[PDB]
Amino acid sequence: ANQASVVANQLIPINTALTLVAMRSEVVTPVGIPAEDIPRLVSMQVNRAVPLGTTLMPDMVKGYAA
């Protein structure tokens, strides 16, 4: 229901570290990474470019296990 996910607040380039300016929370479908894990995601790198407004999915973040 209102399970919110991490959404790209700006484009995140391939192989670049996640910052707090880059991740917002939003109720989207399909469900991606829980918004509650944003602190945890800071400094982890994405393995692909993530366009503005894309939901961060588990497979996009290098080293993410939940």
PDB file of C-alpha atoms in Angstrom:
ATOM      1  CA  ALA A   1       0.000   0.000   0.000  1.00  0.00           C
ATOM      2  CA  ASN A   2       1.900   3.210   0.947  1.00  0.00           C
ATOM      3  CA  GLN A   3       5.249   1.437   0.784  1.00  0.00           C
ATOM      4  CA  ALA A   4       7.531   4.098  -0.543  1.00  0.00           C
ATOM      5  CA  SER A   5      10.655   3.460  -2.572  1.00  0.00           C
ATOM      6  CA  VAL A   6      13.900   5.265  -3.332  1.00  0.00           C
ATOM      7  CA  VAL A   7      13.514   7.378  -6.512  1.00  0.00           C
ATOM      8  CA  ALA A   8      16.337   9.217  -8.322  1.00  0.00           C
ATOM      9  CA  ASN A   9      15.953  12.905  -7.472  1.00  0.00           C
ATOM     10  CA  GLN A  10      18.567  13.706 -10.140  1.00  0.00           C
ATOM     11  CA  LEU A  11      20.361  11.561 -12.805  1.00  0.00           C
ATOM     12  CA  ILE A  12      22.926   9.282 -11.120  1.00  0.00           C
ATOM     13  CA  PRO A  13      25.748   8.513 -13.678  1.00  0.00           C
ATOM     14  CA  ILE A  14      27.103   4.951 -14.050  1.00  0.00           C
ATOM     15  CA  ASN A  15      29.663   3.941 -11.424  1.00  0.00           C
ATOM     16  CA  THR A  16      29.004   6.949  -9.281  1.00  0.00           C
ATOM     17  CA  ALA A  17      28.341   7.007  -5.542  1.00  0.00           C
ATOM     18  CA  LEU A  18      24.841   7.627  -4.107  1.00  0.00           C
ATOM     19  CA  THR A  19      24.407  10.941  -2.196  1.00  0.00           C
ATOM     20  CA  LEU A  20      21.464  12.308  -0.065  1.00  0.00           C
ATOM     21  CA  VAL A  21      20.720  15.029  -2.734  1.00  0.00           C
ATOM     22  CA  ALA A  22      20.195  12.249  -5.271  1.00  0.00           C
ATOM     23  CA  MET A  23      17.549  10.083  -3.472  1.00  0.00           C
ATOM     24  CA  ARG A  24      13.988  10.995  -2.696  1.00  0.00           C
ATOM     25  CA  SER A  25      11.138   8.778  -1.489  1.00  0.00           C
ATOM     26  CA  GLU A  26       7.905   8.184  -3.340  1.00  0.00           C
ATOM     27  CA  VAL A  27       5.082   5.622  -3.441  1.00  0.00           C
ATOM     28  CA  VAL A  28       5.697   4.047  -6.888  1.00  0.00           C
ATOM     29  CA  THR A  29       4.867   0.764  -8.654  1.00  0.00           C
ATOM     30  CA  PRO A  30       6.759  -1.582  -9.015  1.00  0.00           C
ATOM     31  CA  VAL A  31       8.220  -1.307  -5.519  1.00  0.00           C
ATOM     32  CA  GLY A  32      12.038  -0.793  -5.428  1.00  0.00           C
ATOM     33  CA  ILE A  33      14.382  -0.346  -2.491  1.00  0.00           C
ATOM     34  CA  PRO A  34      12.475   0.741   0.732  1.00  0.00           C
ATOM     35  CA  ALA A  35      12.819   4.461   1.396  1.00  0.00           C
ATOM     36  CA  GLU A  36      13.952   3.509   4.892  1.00  0.00           C
ATOM     37  CA  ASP A  37      17.309   2.247   3.395  1.00  0.00           C
ATOM     38  CA  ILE A  38      18.382   5.712   2.028  1.00  0.00           C
ATOM     39  CA  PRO A  39      20.990   6.239   4.933  1.00  0.00           C
ATOM     40  CA  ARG A  40      22.382   2.796   4.129  1.00  0.00           C
ATOM     41  CA  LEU A  41      22.644   3.559   0.391  1.00  0.00           C
ATOM     42  CA  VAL A  42      24.806   6.721   0.809  1.00  0.00           C
ATOM     43  CA  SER A  43      28.268   6.128  -0.806  1.00  0.00           C
ATOM     44  CA  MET A  44      27.259   2.865  -2.584  1.00  0.00           C
ATOM     45  CA  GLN A  45      27.761   3.066  -6.362  1.00  0.00           C
ATOM     46  CA  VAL A  46      25.275   2.323  -9.052  1.00  0.00           C
ATOM     47  CA  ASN A  47      26.218  -0.119 -11.797  1.00  0.00           C
ATOM     48  CA  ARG A  48      24.273   1.728 -14.502  1.00  0.00           C
ATOM     49  CA  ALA A  49      23.077   5.280 -15.228  1.00  0.00           C
ATOM     50  CA  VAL A  50      19.880   5.932 -13.270  1.00  0.00           C
ATOM     51  CA  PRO A  51      17.714   8.635 -15.035  1.00  0.00           C
ATOM     52  CA  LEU A  52      15.773  11.295 -13.096  1.00  0.00           C
ATOM     53  CA  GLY A  53      12.587   9.799 -11.594  1.00  0.00           C
ATOM     54  CA  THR A  54      13.707   6.132 -11.903  1.00  0.00           C
ATOM     55  CA  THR A  55      12.954   3.829  -8.924  1.00  0.00           C
ATOM     56  CA  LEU A  56      16.238   2.407  -7.442  1.00  0.00           C
ATOM     57  CA  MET A  57      15.990  -1.354  -7.712  1.00  0.00           C
ATOM     58  CA  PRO A  58      18.239  -3.829  -5.678  1.00  0.00           C
ATOM     59  CA  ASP A  59      20.143  -4.991  -8.761  1.00  0.00           C
ATOM     60  CA  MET A  60      21.239  -1.400  -9.643  1.00  0.00           C
ATOM     61  CA  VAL A  61      23.350  -0.896  -6.550  1.00  0.00           C
ATOM     62  CA  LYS A  62      26.673  -2.546  -6.222  1.00  0.00           C
ATOM     63  CA  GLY A  63      27.005  -4.255  -2.851  1.00  0.00           C
ATOM     64  CA  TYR A  64      23.340  -3.889  -1.846  1.00  0.00           C
ATOM     65  CA  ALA A  65      21.902  -6.880  -0.019  1.00  0.00           C
ATOM     66  CA  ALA A  66      18.759  -6.170   2.117  1.00  0.00           C
TER      67      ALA A  66
END
